[PDB]
Ligand binder design. Structure first.
Ligand SMILES: O=C(O)[C@H]1O[C@H](O[C@@H]2[C@H](O)[C@@H](O)[C@@H](O[C@@H]3[C@H](O)[C@@H](O)[C@@H](O)O[C@@H]3C(=O)O)O[C@@H]2C(=O)O)[C@H](O)[C@@H](O)[C@H]1O
Length: 404
């Protein structure tokens, strides 16, 4: 008898397929039981952090790429998957993708899929507005006035949570200036004080121009998951800047026959880089101190490589990196080039994207600080100037703690 625990996050579609994969795995291995621990994204890292701090984390965990510095600065924070290569077919995964999940020579997770935030739009609402999807940053900014006037005050081209906004304005700044956002060598942000003023001024411009809800307006609804909010469901918030790897969590909640459709990616004339936040979407990792590394490795291999596991899991985590899995799903007609998640990935790959985001750009305290910052602007407690200086100062402080 081997008892394993596995955690993951996601929407209920992902919960469904994962649970069904676990029953097959157990059917194939009567001596191995897996206790499933799953939630939505909200608070998931917080809960795992508490487990790891106390040494009680699961045997198998779905993990995020920005968590590697948080838990595994020296690469020993998760079990070294090179040590279980007998059970786990590593050759299915591109070596450059494995490099992204390797730390000090130790393989900390198997990357499941890749992803980038891109624009997806509610086709029903945009048709009502009579507008085509923005092809430029100018058209995005201009869409807000059209939505507000043609459809009504409650209508917005997109909705953006603060993390989405942080990535979006970074993309714009990368297009303009072609420099990394984080200066990893000097453990600090790379932007001049002027560029930070520009960053927050763009936010203010977008809010003023009715592109997306302000934080104050968003709060007036304001606590469920974004994809479960009424103005999302009914099409009033007509788009999202979101991972292709989890786009059905969003599209599944729209009101038929509305669909989420892939939009253009705005590119500044003369930009050398799109400034995508492009990364491994998520990983499967093994607990550092698991008493069952081999059985844990068997479970990962089953989910990511086995015919039954791949079939069960389908596309709920995006387009598989595993060569056998992605071939299988194309062959079964599950992967369709016209599907917004697949099309979104293909568009992103063709965009010039040589700049790779630092994992510290997605440090959760940096992301939280950003939310506080824009809230200061929207609630009239700091000017754009004061907010920029505050973000630069407090962010550099967080980065120093994060990168120690
Ligand atoms: O495919 C995935 O599950 C995805 O998970 C991570 O992204 C999380 C979250 O799961 C995403 O839905 C998205 O979350 C939304 C907002 O962007 C976020 O700021 C927060 O408000 O919650 C929203 C939500 O719950 O849907 O973005 C999240 C994030 O980027 O942290 C991984 O990061 C991602 O790569 C992928 O595995």
């Amino acid at each position: 008898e081997v008892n394993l625990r596995m955690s993951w996050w996601g929407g209920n579609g992902r919960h469904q397929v994962t649970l069904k994969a676990l029953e097959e795995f157990h059917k194939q291995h009567p001596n191995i039981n897996v206790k499933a621990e799953y939630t939505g994204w909200d608070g998931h890292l917080s809960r795992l952090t508490t487990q790891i701090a106390g040494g009680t984390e699961p045997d198998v965990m779905q993990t995020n790429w920005n968590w590697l510095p948080i838990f595994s600065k020296d690469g020993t924070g998760f079990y070294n998957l090179f040590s279980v290569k007998e059970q786990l077919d590593l050759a299915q995964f591109d070596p450059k993708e494995l490099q992204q999940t390797t730390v000090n020579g130790k393989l900390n997770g198997i990357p499941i899929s890749v992803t980038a935030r891109i624009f997806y739009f509610n086709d029903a609402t945009w048709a009502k507005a009579g507008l085509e999807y923005p092809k430029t940053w100018d058209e995005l900014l201009a869409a807000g006035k059209v939505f507000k006037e043609k459809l009504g005050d409650q209508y917005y081209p997109v909705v953006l949570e603060h993390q989405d906004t942080l990535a979006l304005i970074r993309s714009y700044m990368t297009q303009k200036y072609n420099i990394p956002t984080i200066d990893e060598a000097n453990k600090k942000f790379a932007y001049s004080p002027e560029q930070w003023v520009e960053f927050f001024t763009m936010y203010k411009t977008m809010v003023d121009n009715h592109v997306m809800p302000s934080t104050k307006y968003y709060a007036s609804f304001g606590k469920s998951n974004m994809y479960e909010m009424k103005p999302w469901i009914n099409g009033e918030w007509a788009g999202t800047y979101m991972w292709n790897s989890t786009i059905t969590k969003y599209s599944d909640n729209l009101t038929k026959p509305a669909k989420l459709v892939l939009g253009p990616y705005p590119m500044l004339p003369g930009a050398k880089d799109a400034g995508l936040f492009f990364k491994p979407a998520q990983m499967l990792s093994i607990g550092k101190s698991t008493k069952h590394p081999q059985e844990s490795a068997m479970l990962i291999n089953f989910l990511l490589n086995s015919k039954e596991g791949v079939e069960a899991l389908g596309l709920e985590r995006g387009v598989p990196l595993s060569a056998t899995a992605v071939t299988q799903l194309r062959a079964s007609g599950v992967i369709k080039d016209e599907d917004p998640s697949v099309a979104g990935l293909n568009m992103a790959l063709e965009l010039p994207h040589k700049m790779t985001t630092s994992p510290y750009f997605d440090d959760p305290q940096i992301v939280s600080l950003f939310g506080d910052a824009i809230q200061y602007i929207d609630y009239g407690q700091k000017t754009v100037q004061e907010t920029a200086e505050y973000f630069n100062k407090q962010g550099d402080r967080i980065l120093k703690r994060a990168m120690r």
